[PDB]
């Protein structure tokens, strides 16, 4: 053939891939975390948006820290050979480096480690996207007038 | 012969390190509603980093908190793109 270039990810596998949406709205009372009003609007919007990008969307609601870790473990052990990419959306409370299950925190590193190149071989060289709506601390941006 | 195990991840954070992130109880979160809008408008047109840059500008310019509590009133937000990707990402092909 003619000259070839390799600057863009191959996105024409038979499937775009999974879009896992974790929508944590209601938290165990003992945690003292407030309900996240408006998050269902987010989850519905994301489902429709990634549906139209041809992702296989899976919505999950109000998962404990244990359920989050097992879900990511299970998904990372699927065969993604026929999939172009992987997307995970996390909607929850958080702080720096952490997102909350309904009953306590999960290290973001624990979640993303399942998809490491050496731990998820069928996603090697494929884009792995983590979209995180959660706090990263308690600082507030006062802004500056333009 | 090897690639880094941390290669080919992208973290689209709603907010900068150390900061709160804002969610409207009626409209949804500033970041997710801007992200979906820009994906809707530009996923057949722009590379993903340029889409997320439009998301940064939308959140930065169009949103400001309203609160009866002076501590939480009139605050702004910038999202935070963290890319370990090794190639451009287009959601379309051919």
């Amino acid at each position: 053939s003619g000259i070839s270039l390799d600057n863009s990810y191959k996105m024409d596998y038979p499937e775009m891939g999974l879009c896992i949406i974790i929508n944590n709205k209601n938290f165990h009372k003992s945690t003292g975390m407030t309900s996240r009003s408006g998050t269902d609007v987010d989850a519905a919007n994301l489902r429709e948006t990634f549906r139209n990008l041809k992702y296989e969307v899976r919505n999950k609601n109000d998962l404990t820290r244990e359920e989050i870790v097992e879900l990511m473990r299970d998904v990372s052990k699927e065969d993604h050979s026929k999939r172009s990419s992987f997307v995970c959306v996390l909607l929850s409370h958080g702080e720096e480096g952490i997102i909350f299950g309904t009953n306590g925190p999960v290290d973001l590193k624990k979640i993303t480690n399942f998809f490491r190149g050496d731990r998820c071989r069928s996603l090697d060289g494929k884009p792995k996207l983590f979209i995180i709506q959660a706090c990263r601390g308690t600082e507030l941006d006062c802004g500056i007038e333009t | 012969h090897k690639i880094p195990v941390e290669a080919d991840f992208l973290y689209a954070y709603s907010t900068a390190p150390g900061y709160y992130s804002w969610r409207n109880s009626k409209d949804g979160s500033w970041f997710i509603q801007s992200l979906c809008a820009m994906l809707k408008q530009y996923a057949d047109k722009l590379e993903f980093m340029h889409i997320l840059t439009r998301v940064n500008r939308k959140v930065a310019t169009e949103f400001e908190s309203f609160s009866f509590d002076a501590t939480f009133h009139a605050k702004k937000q910038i999202p935070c793109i963290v890319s370990m990707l090794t190639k451009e990402l287009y959601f379309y092909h051919h």
């Binding site: 958080g94 709506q133 706090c135 | -």
Partner: peptide, 4 residues
């Protein structure tokens, strides 16, 4: 407007 609420924080996360």
């Amino acid at each position: 407007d609420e924080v996360d």
